[PDB]
């Protein structure tokens, strides 16, 4: 929708820093919410990552494209599979030192 | 012409469907076209003996009609569009058609289902529908609820095997125990 | 296995019109499914190509970010997170009408209100930071393109599934049900014509007997 | 059988449309099945009095038939994708079936629509359709054009509301001004 104008980033620290340098993600002052939240495997937990992804997909209506790390998506594979709705889109970008896995991609799995 | 004149003169239509005659679904009473104009005069007998009989019967008719509409919808455009409550309606109506309506007249148990046994079975099936509806409205997923309450569903479907020869007092106690255990199981599944 | 239609000549004509319309719709929808499936094959091929492009672009963007961090001597992630008051990059959905569908395609945009990056206060490596920012902006544009393509893929697949389901539903229910209703109505009309013929034959026999008597 | 014989032996036949009657659209005359074999012989009177009447009624018949086929396709395939020309065709046909074809017999204004008034209304409707088609062929977006020309569409709809008792001289002057400003309104 036209309301969804943002690029959510839930990838690793390096990928989150790169996205922030690009300017895709930001923290809304009035809403006290960050479009791009830095999260790693050690940081927070799998349940916290899944909750953040669900909030970005549904609660964060402004989010249009979601960028999640492949390592992060591995622990959130169930959430990725459950996110069958086209909007917001999900991109299976991988983190540092981890090659992208076509099999692990949820969108490519439908093929 | 004979059928039309007979329907013009008679008051009760126990129409039979051959699609149900096949696949051994006797009695094959076509619940849609069938009617009975004696329900209004039988309301007095029902109030005298089994007060909840008309309301349970109307609930069963509503369930069957709603599930017939949903069956047309699912045959047209699949089952993905149907809501949770639609899924419960379809499942409970299939249960009713398979267990309650389908009565084998040549088995020992279902050769003669008396009025009290029929009333108890409607109470059990309608209570199962109501409990599933309430549990789903509470937020429980229907698939998980069905997986957990398959035992209760099988107990409800197996209520047709209760011998009417055991007497009204003994079987009605069995139906009361079935309803109590059903309520406990649904509460546990919801919790 | 039929429709509850009252056998009449008008009803027969209505059911023939329904059968003709259902056949036309079935042919049209089968052809539309074929065209949409060709578009879908093109879409999935572009998805594979964009996935490879995403892999190479993310690899080079990670390399550039690592080089910028090494040049600066510290992780700029904290500074970037601090300077996240507003987003200079935004995506606007565009209702691109490919074939008959209206799949939404995202269109990237750049907001100059907060276009300033975190180069200031980074300590050192300003040129490296700017190069990394440009590489990340190119990666973000590629990400927007890939997300638009994936959303188009999902919408197109859903529409194709619905259309194929409706084609099968027509061909296996509506056409057979309407054909059966046509056959039954024709049979009942023939039965009425035969009954009228027998009644007229009885009348003719009575008239002939009366003529013989007279 | 009586209808079959009457159609076989008649020259004009105004057929009933059950669909139009069930919509309470009056008069409920089915355009597809109806006919009149007096168009050719009446071409003389039309050329003598209202020269553009035959081509206008042929244009409206073509519009109605094209939009009937397009509406069948719409009811079949959802009308998700339609060209600008096709959208104009359906919109113009709906406008015709609501304003020109439909009329209230008991209403004061539309109790008896004269022949000159009917010719002027055909002029208005056909000119609207042709100018919209020309604009769409130029490259204008149909949605924006309709948003801008809702006023002109309302004017050509109120052409039905135009009173016939004002006389042929005054009313035709009004229709002359109606499509005069209609041409200029499509420049934007
Ligand atoms: N209530 C029932 N329980 C079991 N079988 C039944 C029942 N009703 C009908 N049937 C079966 O249907 C078969 C056909 O008998 P029926 O249909 O009653 O004769 P008719 O063709 O005269 O109606 C029988 O063989 C019987 O086994």
């Amino acid at each position: 929708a036209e309301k969804r104008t943002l690029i959510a980033v839930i990838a690793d620290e390096d990928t989150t820093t790169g996205l922030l340098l690009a300017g895709i993600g930001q923290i809304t002052p009035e809403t006290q919410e960050k479009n791009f939240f830095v999260y790693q495997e050690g940081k927070t937990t799998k349940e916290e990552i899944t909750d953040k992804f669900n909030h970005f997909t549904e609660e964060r209506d402004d989010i249009a494209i979601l960028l999640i790390n492949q390592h992060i998506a591995e622990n959130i594979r169930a959430r990725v599979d459950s996110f069958t709705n086209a909007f917001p889109a999900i991109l299976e970008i991988p983190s540092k030192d981890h090659p992208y896995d076509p099999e692990k991609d949820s969108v490519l799995k439908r093929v | 012409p004979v059928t039309t004149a007979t329907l013009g003169i008679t008051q009760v239509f126990w129409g039979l469907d051959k699609k149900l005659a096949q696949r051994k679904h006797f009695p094959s009473i076509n619940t849609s076209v069938s009617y009975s104009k004696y329900t209004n005069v039988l309301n007095k007998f029902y109030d005298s003996n089994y007060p909840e009989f008309p309301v349970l019967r109307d609930r069963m008719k509503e369930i069957l009609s709603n599930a017939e509409e949903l069956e047309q919808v699912v045959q047209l455009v699949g089952k993905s569009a149907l809501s949770d409550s639609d899924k419960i309606t379809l499942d409970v109506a299939t249960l009713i058609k398979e267990d309650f309506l389908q009565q084998n007249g040549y088995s020992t148990y279902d050769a003669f289902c008396p009025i009290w046994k029929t009333f108890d079975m409607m109470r059990a099936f309608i209570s199962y529908h109501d409990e599933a509806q309430k549990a789903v409205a509470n937020g429980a997923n229907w698939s998980k609820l069905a997986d957990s309450t398959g035992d209760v569903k099988h107990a409800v479907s197996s209520s047709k095997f209760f011998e009417p020869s055991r007497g009204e007092k003994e079987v009605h106690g069995e139906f009361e125990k079935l309803l109590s255990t059903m309520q406990e199981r649904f509460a546990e599944s919801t919790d | 296995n039929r429709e509850q239609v009252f056998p009449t000549r008008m009803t027969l004509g209505l059911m023939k019109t329904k059968l003709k319309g259902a056949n036309q719709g079935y042919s049209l929808l089968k052809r539309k499914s074929e065209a949409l499936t060709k578009r879908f094959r093109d879409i999935t091929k572009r998805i594979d190509d964009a996935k490879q492009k995403m892999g190479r672009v993310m690899q080079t963007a990670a390399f550039s970010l690592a080089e910028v961090s090494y040049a600066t001597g510290e992780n700029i992630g904290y500074q970037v997170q601090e300077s996240v008051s507003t987003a200079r990059f935004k995506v606007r959905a565009r209702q691109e009408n490919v074939s008959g569908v209206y799949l939404s395609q995202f269109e990237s945009y750049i907001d100059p209100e907060i276009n300033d990056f975190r180069l200031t206060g980074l300590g050192r490596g300003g040129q490296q930071v700017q190069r990394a920012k440009e590489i990340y902006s190119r990666a973000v544009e590629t990400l927007v393109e890939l997300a638009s393509l994936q959303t188009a893929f999902i919408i197109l697949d859903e529409v194709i599934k619905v259309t194929n389901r409706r084609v099968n539903a027509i061909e296996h229910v509506i056409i057979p049900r309407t054909e059966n209703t046509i056959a039954y109505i024709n049979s009942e009309l023939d039965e009425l014509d035969r009954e009228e013929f027998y009644r007229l034959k009885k009348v003719q026999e009575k008239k002939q007997n009366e003529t013989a008597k007279l």
Side-chain angles (χ1 to χ4, degrees), chain A residues 1 8 11 18 22-23 25 29 42 64 73 78 86 88-89 94 99 102, chain B residues 1-16 18 20-31 33-43 45-46 49-51 53-61 63-64 66-67 70 72-74 78 81-82 85 87-90 92-97 100-106 108-109 111-126 128-129 132-133 135-137 139-140 142 145-146 150 153-167 171-173 175 178-179 182-183 185-187, chain C residues 2 6-7 9 11-13 15-16 18-19 21-23 25-29 32 35-37 40-41 43-44 46-47 50 54-58 60-63 66 71 73 77 87 89 93 98 100 112 121 123 125-126 132 139 147 152-153 155-156 159-160 162-170 172-178 180-186 189 191-192 194 197-201 203-204 212:
Chain B
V2 61
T3 301
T4 53
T6 316
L7 297 191
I9 192 66
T10 193
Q11 291 279 78
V12 161
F13 177 73
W14 291 339
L16 305 164
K18 212 191 197 300
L20 271 51
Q22 308 160 7
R23 85 209 200 74
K24 306 292 174 278
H25 183 278
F26 308 106
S28 63
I29 298 293
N30 200 1
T31 315
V33 288
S34 293
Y35 63 82
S36 172
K37 291 178 66 192
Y38 285 129
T39 55
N40 283 320
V41 307
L42 281 180
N43 268 18
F45 160 81
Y46 290 149
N49 294 23
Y50 308 102
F53 207 100
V55 297
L56 288 189
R57 184 271 306 280
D58 283 318
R59 288 218 56 204
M60 211 155 278
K61 267 178 181 175
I63 291 179
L64 294 188
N66 288 294
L70 297 186
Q72 303 294 340
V73 165
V74 69
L82 306 184
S85 163
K87 300 192 144 51
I88 296 89
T89 296
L90 267 176
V92 175
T94 291
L95 179 77
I96 287 161
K97 291 147 78 59
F100 177 80
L101 295 187
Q102 201 262 335
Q103 166 173 335
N104 183 296
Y106 296 127
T108 62
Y109 45 87
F112 170 52
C113 279
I115 188 55
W116 58 269
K117 172 154 170 225
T118 302
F119 170 53
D120 283 303
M121 293 177 70
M122 293 183 286
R123 213 164 43 104
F125 283 65
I126 292 303
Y128 170 83
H129 174 264
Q133 285 297 90
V136 169
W142 170 233
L145 184 74
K153 184 177 180 180
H154 178 254
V156 167
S157 172
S158 158
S159 66
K160 72 180 182 177
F161 300 123
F162 285 136
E163 291 295 19
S165 71
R166 291 160 64 182
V171 171
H172 181 218
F175 269 99
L178 199 151
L179 288 159
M182 181 176 117
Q183 203 144 300
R185 284 301 320 308
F186 267 99
Chain C
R2 68 184 68 188
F6 313 134
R9 184 61 60 151
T11 300
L12 183 63
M15 288 284 120
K16 304 192 101 73
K18 192 150 146 47
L19 174 73
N23 269 305
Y26 159 69
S27 170
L28 259 56
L29 283 188
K32 178 206 194 177
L36 271 188
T37 305
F40 181 82
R41 280 185 216 292
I43 287 294
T44 187
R46 304 191 321 151
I47 294 297
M54 185 64 72
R56 54 180 56 90
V57 164
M58 71 185 218
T60 194
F63 267 44
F89 209 57
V98 65
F153 164 90
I155 298 310
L156 190 62
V159 169
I160 280 179
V162 173
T163 291
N164 265 335
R165 168 188 305 147
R166 214 151 51 71
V167 175
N168 295 330
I170 286 181
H172 291 164
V173 171
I174 309 304
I175 301 282
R177 194 211 300 300
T178 305
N180 291 14
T181 300
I182 287 280
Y184 164 77
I185 286 172
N186 198 354
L189 281 175
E191 194 63 35
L192 277 169
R194 180 184 302 114
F197 183 94
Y198 178 50
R199 215 165 304 120
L200 291 184
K201 272 302 270 164
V203 173
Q204 167 182 74

